Design a protein around this ligand. Structure first.
Ligand SMILES: *C(=O)N1C[C@H](NOS(=O)(=O)O)CC[C@H]1C(=O)NC1CCNCC1
Ligand SMILES: [Cl-]
Ligand SMILES: [Zn+2]
Ligand SMILES: [Zn+2]
Length: 358
């Protein structure tokens, strides 16, 4: 790799690892459209298995960017419209509070206060229906953004219904396979388990536990090589030959809502570039990112702006992830770690690197 990339990566990530006590880490820096790979530490401490470019990490909420693009692909196929009512795809949701709640609201966390998690007691389809049927909104739809797995999670499950495919089958055939993300999994096959890093929480080795709508909201696992290719695909959608996927990527970076200097896409979040680094750093803290915040609708949604900072954070019990890219600069970064450490430290490090390479 160019010396300037090697230098800034060492001076930024090695101290981050020292500071946060991260056992293993993989980073890809995309510079002029080309990925450069870096690894540190161990995927499995006790086995002394090093992190490699083949190591699988839990992406956590970065999974939502796949969900958003799959939803955009469905829009481009004409299978769904974001203005469609939720009840069009789940007629059994007869409770009156669902009148006026659209796929757009589900996808962008603006349905009116759907909770951060689907309750852990939801283990059956019957349970899931009762959960949504009895949920009572705190606000009218389209007025407040409250980040919620139960919101975009339901969007993903309903967006694939017109295809007749399961969410996992839809994602594999329509997103993963066309983009040659051949080591990206909702469910890690047995033959690939050997590459699956352990997460570490308070010293204990852990993997994410199954839950309702997990695939849609936080359940994808991937390698640093596949995630670099994912970033390349979102930097350069015109290189994607499948027109519905090309357009789906573009639609996920459209700007549907604004709050402060932040714009809500489908999974992705965006800010204008050049960005105020303190905004993205401070705004990534859970105290802010998870707070209910008023939103202003953008009608029609702004088509993907090339001069944007596009990004997403993710976490599981034992992992911490971050992806950020700037289409106009063909510049991006993927940071995968097998410890959950605070978002602001990830974002700060990412901005130090990309700012140095602009
Ligand atoms: C996604 O990784 N999430 C959503 C939320 N934080 O959003 S983020 O952008 O700052 O990452 C909470 C943390 C995380 C999440 O929901 N993790 C689940 C916790 C419960 N067990 C399964 C994973
Ligand atoms: Cl140094
Ligand atoms: Zn040093
Ligand atoms: Zn393989």
């Amino acid at each position: 790799a160019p010396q300037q990339i090697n230098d800034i990566v060492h001076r930024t990530i090695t101290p981050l690892i020292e500071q946060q006590k991260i056992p293993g880490m993989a980073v890809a820096v995309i510079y002029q459209g080309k990925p450069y790979y870096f690894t540190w530490g161990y995927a499995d401490i006790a086995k002394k298995q090093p992190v490699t470019q083949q190591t699988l990490f839990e992406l956590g909420s970065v999974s939502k960017t796949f969900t958003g693009v799959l939803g955009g692909d469905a829009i481009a196929r004409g299978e769904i419209k974001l203005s469609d009512p939720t009840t069009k795809y789940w007629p059994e949701l007869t409770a009156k509070q669902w009148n006026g709640i659209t796929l757009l609201h589900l996808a962008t966390y603006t349905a009116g206060g759907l909770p951060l998690q689907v309750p852990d007691e939801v283990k059956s389809s019957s349970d899931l229906l009762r959960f949504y049927q009895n949920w009572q909104p705190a606000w009218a739809p389209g007025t407040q953004r409250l980040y919620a797995n139960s919101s975009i999670g339901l969007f993903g499950a309903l967006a694939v219904k017109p295809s007749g495919l399961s969410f996992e089958q839809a994602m594999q055939t329509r997103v993963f396979q066309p983009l040659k993300l051949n080591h990206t999994w909702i469910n890690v096959p047995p033959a690939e388990e050997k590459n699956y890093a352990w997460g570490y929480r308070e010293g204990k080795a852990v993997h994410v536990s199954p839950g309702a709508l997990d695939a849609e909201a936080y359940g994808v696992k991937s390698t640093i090589e596949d995630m670099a290719r994912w970033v390349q695909s979102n930097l350069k959608p015109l290189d994607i030959n499948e027109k519905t996927l090309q357009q789906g990527i573009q639609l996920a970076q459209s700007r549907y809502w604004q709050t402060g200097d932040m714009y809500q896409g489908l999974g992705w979040e965006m800010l204008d570039w050049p960005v105020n680094p303190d905004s993205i750093i401070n705004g990534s803290d859970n105290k802010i990112a998870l707070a209910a915040r008023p939103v202003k609708a953008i009608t029609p949604p702004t088509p993907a702006v090339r001069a944007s900072w596009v990004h997403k954070t993710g976490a599981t019990g034992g992992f911490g992830s971050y992806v950020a890219f700037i289409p106009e600069k063909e510049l991006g970064i993927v940071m995968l770690a097998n410890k959950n450490y605070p978002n602001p430290a990830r974002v700060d490090a990412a901005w130090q690197i990309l700012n140095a390479l602009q």
